[PDB]
Amino acid sequence: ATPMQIRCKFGSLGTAKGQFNSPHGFCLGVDEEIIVADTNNHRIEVFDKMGALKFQFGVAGKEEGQLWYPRKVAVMHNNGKFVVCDRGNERSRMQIFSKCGHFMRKIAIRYIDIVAGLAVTAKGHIVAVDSVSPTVFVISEEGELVRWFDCSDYMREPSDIAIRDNDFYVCDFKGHCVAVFQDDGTFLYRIGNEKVTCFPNGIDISNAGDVLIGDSHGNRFHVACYSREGALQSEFECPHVKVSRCCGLKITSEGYVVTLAKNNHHVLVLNTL
Known part of the structure; x- marks a missing residue:
């Protein structure tokens, strides 16, 4: 098997900016930011590819616009909006946020x-x-x-x-x-x-x-x-x-491989040897 090297490892267990608690999902942004659903901290964290935090958003709760154990995140390529899936009242919930992280709307997914x-x-x-x-x-x-x-x-x-x-x-x-x-x-x-x-x-x-x-x-x-x-x-x-x-697993335009070490509360950015 071809070796991979660690290009960047960032994150640790905690509540502070740039830390994580059991993050369950991530994606790449319009500018290939590394965007992490920081599940147990009820927030989205947006990083560059060397682990520098750009901004975060999300307040814990079940009101529309709040986040409650967000586990999956995607970004709409054509306008930068975030799609975030978390746990609403009882069942799963899908919400759209602006590129600033501002709540825009909830998408009913009672069929999921x-x-x-x-x-x-x-x-x-x-x-x-x-x-x-x-x-x-x-x-x-x-x-x-x-x-x-x-x-x-x-x-x-x-x-x-x-x-x-x-x-x-x-x-x-x-x-x-x-x-x-x-x-x-x-x-x-x-x-x-x-x-x-x-x-x-x-x-x-x-x-x-x-x-x-x-x-x-x-x-x-x-x-x-x-x-x-x-x-x-x-x-x-x-x-x-x-x-x-x-x-x-996400591939950057440089060919780097990004993955999430959920159980150890960090992101890994890897390059092929």
Whole structure:
């Protein structure tokens, strides 16, 4: 496996600016800021790629505009708005914030149990995948349910999702693979398997269209790189350092790999050797 080096490791357990408490999700921003859903502190934290905090937003609570254990975050490429999913009254809740972090609106998602994966398409549609009843939902910026399709026959437990142009690649945490769907919802094929991609919890798609699938089975961060059609190209690991368990996977334009060490309350930015 090709080694990965630590380019930046930032965060520690706490409440202070730049600290985390069990962060469950992250994304990249319009300017590829590292944007973290700092779950147990009820806030979003926005960083540059060397871990410098730009700003944070979020007050703990269940009022509209407040955050309550936010676990997933995405940014709308065309206007910088944040899409944040947390726990509302009883069930999951989706809220839209401005690029300043100001509450704009709540999107009713009573048809979703758990948001296990969150992404935004090129056209500006919000994609949320449910892990309990495996289902994909495509949602407009103004809250319209544009499309949904059932994937329970083809998936066990979704854990992340990525989109390239118009197909959906869904991480199957308990299926040990990625499931590929069209925008139609028509299933196409799977990428990976239990040998290489064990308990995958992160996926992103390189510019070239390759599929990067992250896992931390051996308590070290491992990445498998597949072609768009499912041919294993390479594997990556951090052999010279003992990386913790991680979740999520995003590729920066430089080719750096970003993941979240949820159980150790920090972000990792990695480069290939």
